[PDB]
């Protein structure tokens, strides 16, 4: 079987549609929620939301897969 785009679940339980959810002006909503409630770090959320448009795909992927 197998399709594209693919639903992705990370080692830490983040969910997004790959690659579409990483090619947008905003970060995937799961990552924003994770930084706010899981890490209790709204500062990180505000800064990722600000850097994201300027972030290359490699770095967005790095964040998405490891956050």
């Amino acid at each position, epitope marked *: 079987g197998g399709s594209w785009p693919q639903r992705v679940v990370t080692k830490k339980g983040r969910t997004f549609l790959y690659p579409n959810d990483l090619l947008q002006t905003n970060p995937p909503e799961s990552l924003i929620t994770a930084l706010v409630e899981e890490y209790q770090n709204p500062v990180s959320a505000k800064e990722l939301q600000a850097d994201w448009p300027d972030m290359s795909f490699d*770095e967005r992927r790095h964040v998405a897969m490891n956050l």
Partner: nanobody
Amino acid sequence: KVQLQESGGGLVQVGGSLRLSCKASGFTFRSSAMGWYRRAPGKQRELVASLTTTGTADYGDFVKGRFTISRDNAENTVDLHMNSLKPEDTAVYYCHEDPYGMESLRYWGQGTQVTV
């Protein structure tokens, strides 16, 4: 893509000084922590020195005022000036960058050998 290039290691005998340099390639996140960890043979990885984008420094216990950590954000680099080195300081020194100061996003350098 973030690549971390390390340089400035090598041997210097006891009482000497070294400069470790690490340049972070790729995106310059608005806030980040940069620093160095070390691993001595058979031992467990230790924090040597770290510094945020705001300017605060954190040193391991053993440093004891011997080391100075500086950062030039323009070129997105960080330099470690180590003085009065001793046999115990011989280890592999790894550079690290933590986007937004978070260990989960950490990039690692390939490590540079320092020998007394």
